[PDB]
Every structure is written in C-alpha cells, then in structure tokens.
Design a protein around this ligand. Structure first.
Ligand SMILES: *[C@H](O)[C@H](C[C@@H]1CCNC1=O)NC(=O)[C@H](CC(C)C)NC(=O)OCc1ccccc1
Ligand SMILES: *[C@H](O)[C@H](C[C@@H]1CCNC1=O)NC(=O)[C@H](CC(C)C)NC(=O)OCc1ccccc1
Lengths: 305, 305
C-alpha cells in the first residue's frame, strides 16, 4: 500500500538525449534513428528572440553550423529541415539505443513523465499533468529546452511533449511534430496563460486511491445527480463532469464498491465545508494530477518490458 | 523556475534488476558483477514467515533451487551465501551493464530515489526520505521486495536501501549489507514503528526554495535564537536544530540574503498561527522531504554522467 507521485522509469529515454549547439546557444535534442529533434529557437541569436523570422534564420545556416554531441561522441549533421516549431537534424549514425516509439498528442488532464536535461545530460525525472489551459507546472532552468515528456505503454515509449519556454512561473511546449500546446508562439512577447481549472475526474480518482489506502473520513451516505454536482463544481472552478468520466472511473468504483455519484456527493461536501484541518493521502488540498489510469496502475501494479 | 518532487534518472539501475524465484516465491534481485542480492526471506515458505530459522532453511537448499531470470535470459546460480538479512547468489555471468557503484548507509532525514519493481521489471520511480523512526512512506505492493533505493553522485550509483516489508502503512528495509534500518526483523510478528517527527532542517530548506521561486508571504522582520526556536519546535514534534544544520543551510541563505535564524522566526510563526488558508509551493502543509542539497540541485541544476 501507499501512494506516491510516481514517474515512469526513464532508462529508455536517457539513451536518446543529446546536446545540440548552434552558435553560442546550447540545448537538448532527442535522437531517434538518424534524426535529432530539438526546438527551432536554437538557431536564434540573443538579438533575435523578440521577433524572429525562422525561415530567414535557417536559410543562412549550413550543416556544419550544428554541433551535435552524444556523450563524448560527435554526430555529423548531413541534413536539416524545419517542421513547425522543431528542427529535424539528419545525422550519419542511427541511434543504436532507439526504443520502439510513437509520437502522440495528449489532451488536458492527462499525465506524463518529464526527463529534465541540461547539456544533453539527464538531471531528474518527475510526473506532471497537462493543465486545462495547456501549460504544465514543471521545474525547468536555463538550458532545459529540448527536454521531453513521455508515457510508457508496455514496451513502447510514447513521446508527447518537448519543452520550449517558461511563461510566468509555468511552462509551455510542443508535441513532437512541433505544434504548440495552447495558443503560444516561440518568441519573447507578452503572452499569458488563460485561467486554469481543477481537473474533476482526476480529483475523484485520487479520492478512490484514498479509500483503497484506508482514508475514509470524508465519505457520507448521500448521493447526487450529475447535473446537481456540475452546478456546484462550476462555482469552484472545477471542470464539469461527463458520463464519459463516470464510465472511466468504473473500475475504481467496482473495486471499492462505492458508486461514482456517491463519491461526487463527498467531493461536493469537501468543496463546500473544506478540509477542516484533516488530510487525505498526506495532502491538505484536493490533488488533481493522478488520472484514473494512474491510480489503477499504482494500486494494482503494472510493469513494463 | 518551479519546484517538483524530483527523482534521479533510473536508467543505470534498471539494468541491474532481475527476477529471483525460490519455490513459489518470486521477488526482485539486484545484479552487480556476478552477484545477485535479494531479501533472504525468498527462502521462506508460507508456513514459515511467523518465526523462520534462516540458517536451517538455507542449508536445506541447493543452487538449483534458485531460478534467476534477467529478461528472457536465465542465470545459473553457482554459489550462495547469507549476509545478515540479504542473500548473495553467485552466478556464472557478470552483469555487463554494471555501473560504478558503492553501498552506503544513509541517516534519517536524507532522501533517495526508489525504483519500484515487480517480477524483475521496473514499474515506477519516486523520491522519498528516511524518516526519523527509520521507516519510509513508500508505495509498494506484493512482489515489490528487493526493489532498491539509490542516490546518484556524478557517475557513481550509491545504493542505500533494499525493500523487505510493510508495517502498518509504512515500509521498512535494509542497507545493501543486509542490516535493517530501525529495530525491525524480517519475520511476521507484531512490531510497530516508533513516533515520527518532522525533519526541521528539511522544512527550512523548502522555505528557501519557496523564496527562490517567488513565495514570500510568510517572511517577517523578526529574528530568534537557536535556543528559543528549539523550545517551540519541541512542542510541535519537530527535530531540534543544531549549529551543523545552520551551516548546511548556508548556501541557501547566501543566495536569498535571508539569515538562517531569520527564517527560523518565520517557521516559528507558521507553527503557532498556521497557514491560515494560504499555500507554499502548491502545498498547504509544511513539506519535509527535500534536503538542503535537493533544493540546491533543483534550483541550480546539477546533471549526471
Ligand atoms: C530553454 O531552456 C529556455 C527555457 C526556459 C529558461 C528558464 N526556464 C525555462 O523553461 N527557453 C527560453 O529561454 C525561451 C526562448 C524562446 C521562446 C525565444 N524563452 C523563455 O522561456 O523566456 C520567455 C519568458 C517570459 C517571461 C518569463 C520567463 C520567460
Ligand atoms: C515483498 O514484496 C513483501 C512486501 C510487502 C507486500 C505488501 N507491501 C509490501 O511492502 N514482503 C512481505 O510480504 C513480508 C515478508 C517477510 C517480512 C516475512 N511481510 C510483510 O510485509 O507483511 C507483514 C505485514 C504486517 C502488517 C501489515 C502489513 C504487512
């Protein structure tokens, strides 16, 4: 038993990280087969980040302007191209440690692991969610650009995120085809994230994890309707709940014998009375960064090969 | 910027995990050079866990009673021995993926990463601390025994923990020489953890991380003395603060220009007035599982090779 913010093992991703230098700008790249992927703003200078014209910047470059380092080994760039906001650098050596992979675009509310890197070198791994406003609350310093986010599916690494920029305390990036999550652009202008909301289905999955681990004090005998719940959730900035969410929570209600709409009644009380100084799973706030699948995986124990 | 419960990249450890089967009991083992390390209770039967005599159990076994699997490869056990509470299984193949390693015993208050495994297969990575009562608050299901805890030092993996048992919601284990943390034994008897306390030096390091990231509301102009602080800390079950702790916090006070004893005055107020419904770094409780070194690493950005 127990419950922890758990990330995926990062070994399969660590073997794909490289250092990409262009000029005096160094960041991380992702090396799969003979392509290195990295943020396109590696080709900006400190006198361009205000309003770059990336097509102009790229035509003025040749392959030898791109220093790609894998450990102490140098990779020769033999071709480059731009795909939306990422650069694809073709190199002469296919990465022998290339795992089975796919590129997927995730939805708000889903979680993934981030392998934070500096100078091509893995520094740390942590779990986070894509927020409803298409930012993540990460931990990134200068030089972390190009760090990637990923899930693991049995044996396949699904790459879903590449890091590009910090806004005001939060973090924004692209999928691996180079398309931004959210209405952001990769230039330094005054852009801000929209209003964040609480991911309701995730809070309910976490209350089920609590019940599974012995925390029961917030339960009650009431029920509510989907519609009566969503009227209260709206007032507290919670995402509305759909019949799809109920079905997804099905495995957890079956395991605890507590109906989804029963649990919504407890959440309604917590939202109106507060925690009153008690904690749930070691937290004094309602946690919304575990999906129903995260709870199942951790409270049942799925491995990976 | 940002602040996350961050674990070490697990790649170097994933290559050392194996499945160890003896009878109908399967758990994980650690494979370094030609030795596999695992909990000695793999040689217990379901009719022995009450009060085993491990020396008797071990003499009744031969090498071929031990099935060691590395992926889909079988390792031949050519010798075994007992070292306190762990089994050392000598095998015919040295692990080619053996990293540079040391075995270290950590102290209460220090943190490490746990690679939770099932059937020799890595499932997840998370960070935790060794509590003052020598338990950890982990997340472990049946079959997780043999999972290891580790720090990474530049290029060397320091192994500090092997998992053995769950008590009442918390988790207990040994160092890699087989000696338990705390006064626990590896049998099923009624043993309980002593009283846990809050790791004061870690709470202060986390308040500094908050200041570094813009959270300043709890600061004040007061100072206190080491002695006046420890009188309040005692009442709230906080570990007493020593002059060694002050010095360790030195790098963080220098970076924020806030003296250690100034910050103790703010902590004293938080302990006496409470949070009053505000949060610090996204938490409504005082967090004690980041060491001063964890804060420096994350708020400055140390990598590993
Ligand atoms: C690449 O490592 C870096 C990521 C930042 C550095 C600090 N933390 C991060 O996540 N990227 C940039 O520096 C990026 C460059 C292009 C978008 C031109 N810009 C960026 O993040 O700075 C804009 C900003 C605005 C307001 C607050 C903080 C940053
Ligand atoms: C090995 O994977 C397993 C670890 C437990 C299983 C559930 N979560 C864990 O961390 N080890 C055991 O089953 C262990 C066997 C030897 C110590 C004989 N015993 C154990 O943890 O059960 C004792 C216990 C007492 C009270 C509550 C829970 C467990």
């Amino acid at each position: 038993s127990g419950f922890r913010k758990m990330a995926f093992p990062s070994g399969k991703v660590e073997g794909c990280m490289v250092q990409v230098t262009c000029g005096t700008t160094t960041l991380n790249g992702l090396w799969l087969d003979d392509v290195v992927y990295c943020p396109r703003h590696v080709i900006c200078t400190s006198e361009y980040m205000l309003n770059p014209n990336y097509e102009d910047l790229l035509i003025r470059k040749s392959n030898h302007n791109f220093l790609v380092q894998a450990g102490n080994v140098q990779l020769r760039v033999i071709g480059h191209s731009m795909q939306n906001c990422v650069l694809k650098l073709k190199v002469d050596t296919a990465n022998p440690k290339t795992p089975k992979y796919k590129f997927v675009r995730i939805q708000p509310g889903q979680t993934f692991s981030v392998l934070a890197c500096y100078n091509g070198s893995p520094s740390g791994v942590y779990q986070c969610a894509m927020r409803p406003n298409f930012t993540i609350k990460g931990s990134f310093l200068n030089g972390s650009c190009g760090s990637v986010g990923f899930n693991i599916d049995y044996d396949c690494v699904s790459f879903c995120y590449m890091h590009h920029m910090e806004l005001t305390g939060v973090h924004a990036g692209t999928d691996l085809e180079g398309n931004f999550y959210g209405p952001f652009v990769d230039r330094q202008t005054a852009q801000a994230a929209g209003t964040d909301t609480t991911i309701t289905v995730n809070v309910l999955a976490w209350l089920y994890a609590a019940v599974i681990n012995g925390d029961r004090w917030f339960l009650n005998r009431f029920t509510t309707t989907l519609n009566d719940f969503n009227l209260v959730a709206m007032k507290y900035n919670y995402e509305p709940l759909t019949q799809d969410h109920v079905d997804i929570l099905g495995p957890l209600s079956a395991q605890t014998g507590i109906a989804v709409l029963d649990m919504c009644a407890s959440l309604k009380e917590l939202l109106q009375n507060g925690m009153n100084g008690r904690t749930i799973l070691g937290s004094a706030l309602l946690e919304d960064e575990f999906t129903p699948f995260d709870v199942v995986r951790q409270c049942s124990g799925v491995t990976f090969q």
